[PDB]
Amino acid sequence: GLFDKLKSLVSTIEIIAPLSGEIVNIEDVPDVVFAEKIVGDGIAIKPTGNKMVAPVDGTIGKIFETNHAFSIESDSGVELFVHFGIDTVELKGEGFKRIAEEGQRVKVGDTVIEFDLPLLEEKAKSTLTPVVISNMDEIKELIKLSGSVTVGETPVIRIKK
């Protein structure tokens, strides 16, 4: 069964969880540009269910052509980068159906990419998904949350500007 045409229980910048699962420290992410804050700073997520969603209300900057990752620009002047797993361009597409469009206006919770996690756990070297602010010069304070998150629902980061 699938509940997408079914109504949902809706209800100082917060970055809402692009996907569900446990929040994991980015320095536990086994690729040093993430582990050492090089490309940006934020958190990681050990993913548990099949979609990747717009983490803020803003425009999609770019979806990588292999579909595993995307860039978003919030209206509050923030730029996030969500990348499923590590070295995931090696898959050449396998496991990822792109849903949103390259330069599209999205509101929070809007699906942007769907994925096939059973495949992706067998094949990708790591499934940990970095969500990082790549805009980090411009933001003054970065608060990092913990524990379980649910896609489109739970807050992961609190940035102040």
Partner: protein
């Protein structure tokens, strides 16, 4: 007053006039032919190297109306390794300059290995048995011309890399001198004893009568009525000095004809075990320090091949425009092993190759792959550098003609996953030779009077595309493994 620097490249001759506190007051570039007799072979005519480098010297001053009176000293930077043997009386070579690039002496090199002289030449020269160095190149000139090894002991003919050929023409024959950085490169000079190694000199049947007086890189060597010649250094070793690197762990990478990455290792000679060289470089006062080195033969020269031979671009500068019109190379790899590989691979038998071609691959996919191979070669030596030194670089200070290209610099920081610090005087090879010269004449007294000038114009950081750096690099290492060992022997 001013300092004149005489920069003599692989493909050009540059002379630049400099005032007190490094301002480029005047410059002159003059190109000369590259001679290719056989495919693996490269060659220059020593007379065209002299014709351009002398006329460049007379240009810069005239441009700025200056002559003798105002110039404190003359420094010299030069392409390293290319051997020249000439006539002492006349001033006429018994052959063309065989270039560093040239692969003809690979046959000789193979015998030196089949003997067992590799652990010797490694541990006393810091070098590797390759066609690249002058050692074998002299033997070849000797073995092929008639008079040669008898006119040799009788003393009518002289050896020289480009630093000693240019001063012997500037002082009308008077002084015949090298400096330590250039002699380190010949494979005839011991790097610990700091004098010509004579097991080498034996093995290659070179008479010791041919050789120059090896001297410091900062010392008045003679005068010319061009007036004192006080600095000499191999071009990449003067680029390291121009970067003011000069201390332990300080490094640069120069993007010229080739890419040469060097790290100063103090007054210690470190043994490489990841394919690099142990060479000599200068310290803060022009004294022998050592340095680790990775040298890749083709880099801005590949961009020159697109333009002149291949005719795909018109300006070397139009490669940035066409490379950034396609987002990727569409699986295409250019391996620029036009004169062997070298780099960490050594192997003189690889020739150039373009891999993974498809029906929709266009010219821009080739142009971008050519620029991209410059950044993949830099990563091959950089990780050999880091595994050798035990130091991880957190920025790559760069210089050379090619760093003016923003796509290449950025692509470079994405594939490395490190920052790339570009300076605003980018061709620092003629500054390290001006500094070595100013110091020996008292025009400067030392490097701290010159800290201020190193001003980083731009710093490139790894953007989000750095996440694919190991997928793209793995493709290059497959491509390289197929260009290798093409030529038979």
């Amino acid at each position: 007053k001013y300092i004149v620097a005489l920069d003599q490249g692989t493909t050009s001759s540059r002379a630049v006039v400099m005032d007190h506190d490094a301002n480029i007051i005047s410059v002159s570039q003059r190109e000369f032919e590259q001679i290719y007799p056989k495919p693996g072979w490269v060659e220059h005519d020593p007379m065209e190297i002299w014709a351009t480098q002398s006329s460049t010297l007379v240009e810069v001053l005239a441009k700025a109306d200056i002559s003798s009176d105002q110039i404190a000293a003359i420094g010299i930077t030069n392409q390293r390794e290319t051997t020249i043997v000439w006539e002492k009386e006349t001033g006429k070579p018994i052959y063309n300059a065989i270039v560093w690039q040239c692969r003809r002496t690979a046959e000789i090199c193979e015998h030196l290995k089949r003997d067992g002289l590799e652990d010797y030449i490694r541990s006393n020269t810091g070098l590797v048995i390759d066609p690249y160095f002058s050692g074998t190149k002299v033997k070849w000139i000797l073995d092929h011309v008639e008079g040669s090894r008898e006119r040799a002991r009788r003393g009518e003919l002289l050896f020289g890399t480009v630093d000693t050929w240019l001063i012997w023409k500037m002082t009308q024959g008077r002084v015949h001198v090298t400096d330590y950085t250039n002699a380190s490169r010949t494979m005839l000079f011991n790097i610990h004893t700091l004098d010509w190694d004579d097991k080498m000199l034996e093995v290659l049947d070179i008479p010791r009568e041919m050789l120059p007086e090896v001297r410091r890189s900062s010392e008045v060597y003679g005068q010319t009525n061009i007036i004192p010649i006080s600095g000499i250094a191999g071009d990449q070793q003067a680029a390291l000095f121009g970067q003011l690197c000069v201390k332990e762990g300080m490094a640069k990478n120069t993007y010229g004809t080739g890419c040469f990455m060097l790290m100063n290792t103090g007054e210690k000679a470190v043994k490489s075990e990841n394919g690099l060289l142990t060479t000599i470089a200068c310290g803060p006062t022009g004294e022998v320090n050592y340095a680790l080195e990775g040298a890749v033969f083709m880099a801005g020269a590949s961009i020159q091949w697109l333009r002149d031979e291949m005719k795909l671009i018109n300006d070397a500068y139009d490669s940035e425009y066409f490379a950034t019109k396609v987002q990727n190379t569409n699986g295409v790899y250019v391996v620029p092993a036009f004169t062997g590989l070298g780099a960490p691979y050594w192997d003189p038998y690889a020739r150039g190759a373009i891999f993974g071609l498809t029906r929709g691959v266009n010219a821009n996919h080739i142009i971008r792959a050519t620029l991209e191979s410059i950044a993949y070669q830099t990563r091959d030596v950089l990780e050999a550098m880091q595994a050798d030194s035990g130091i991880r670089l957190h920025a790559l200070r760069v210089d050379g003609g090619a760093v003016a290209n923003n796509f290449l610099m950025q692509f470079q920081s994405d594939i490395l996953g490190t920052r790339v610090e570009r300076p605003e005087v980018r061709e620092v090879t003629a500054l390290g030779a001006a500094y070595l010269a100013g110091l020996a004449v008292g025009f400067w007294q030392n490097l701290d009077e010159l800290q201020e000038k190193a001003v980083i114009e731009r710093e490139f950081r790894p953007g989000i595309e750095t996440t694919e750096r190991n997928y793209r690099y793995a493709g290059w290492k497959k491509a390289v493994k197929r260009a290798m060992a093409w030529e038979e022997h």
